[PDB]
Amino acid sequence: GCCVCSDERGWAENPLVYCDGHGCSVAVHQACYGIVQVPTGPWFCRKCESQERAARVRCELCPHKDGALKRTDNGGWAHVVCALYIPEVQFANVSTMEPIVLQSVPHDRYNKTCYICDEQGRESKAATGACMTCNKHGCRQAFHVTCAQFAGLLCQYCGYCKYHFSKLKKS
Numbered sequence: 001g002c003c004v005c006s007d008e009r010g011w012a013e014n015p016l017v018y019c020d021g022h023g024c025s026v027a028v029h030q031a032c033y034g035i036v037q038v039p040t041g042p043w044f045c046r047k048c049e050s051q052e053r054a055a056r057v058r059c060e061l062c063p064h065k066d067g068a069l070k071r072t073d074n075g076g077w078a079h080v081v082c083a084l085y086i087p088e089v090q091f092a093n094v095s096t097m098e099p100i101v102l103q104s105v106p107h108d109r110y111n112k113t114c115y116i117c118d119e120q121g122r123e124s125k126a127a128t129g130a131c132m133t134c135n136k137h138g139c140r141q142a143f144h145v146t147c148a149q150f151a152g153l154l155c156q157y158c159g160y161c162k163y164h165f166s167k168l169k170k171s
């Protein structure tokens, strides 16, 4: 489906677009990646269009490689999905969704430990990047956006730790 949201198909007015770059598996809705007009030929994501060392084109807000990336204001790269769920992250242009603006992200997002990384053999990565916090008031569980994404814990634009998600009646 889409690398950014949890919708598996596109819509006529918002198609699901597949990157044709070699080795790349990025697929995004037009609206999930800020694509202005849908391409008539092969389409390439910003990473595949990049001429940078591959080791460098990766999200600085989380430890997962690949996925749907845009350039940042500090000369780096970040996931669109990480940008959408860390509250203080912004975009210079919300239509094109780029560059991703990190200058207003506070210390508070960078001094946490991702509990999911800690559980999944990524202890060395748990205190890197930026974390969202569980939406339950009083809960101190913190986690990378993409770690929660893969765990099915993301939901405007918030998430829960596994425990509080388990305590919420699903409707």
Ligand SMILES: [Zn+2]
Pocket (backbone or CB within 6 Å): 002, 003, 004, 005, 006, 007, 028, 029, 032
């Ligand atoms: Zn999407």
Ligand SMILES: [Zn+2]
Pocket (backbone or CB within 6 Å): 019, 020, 021, 024, 025, 026, 044, 045, 046, 047, 048, 049
């Ligand atoms: Zn690509």
Ligand SMILES: [Zn+2]
Pocket (backbone or CB within 6 Å): 059, 060, 061, 062, 063, 064, 078, 079, 082, 146
């Ligand atoms: Zn990320």
Ligand SMILES: [Zn+2]
Pocket (backbone or CB within 6 Å): 063, 114, 115, 116, 117, 118, 125, 126, 143, 144, 147
């Ligand atoms: Zn994590």
Ligand SMILES: [Zn+2]
Pocket (backbone or CB within 6 Å): 134, 135, 136, 139, 140, 141, 160, 161, 162, 163, 164
């Ligand atoms: Zn919680």
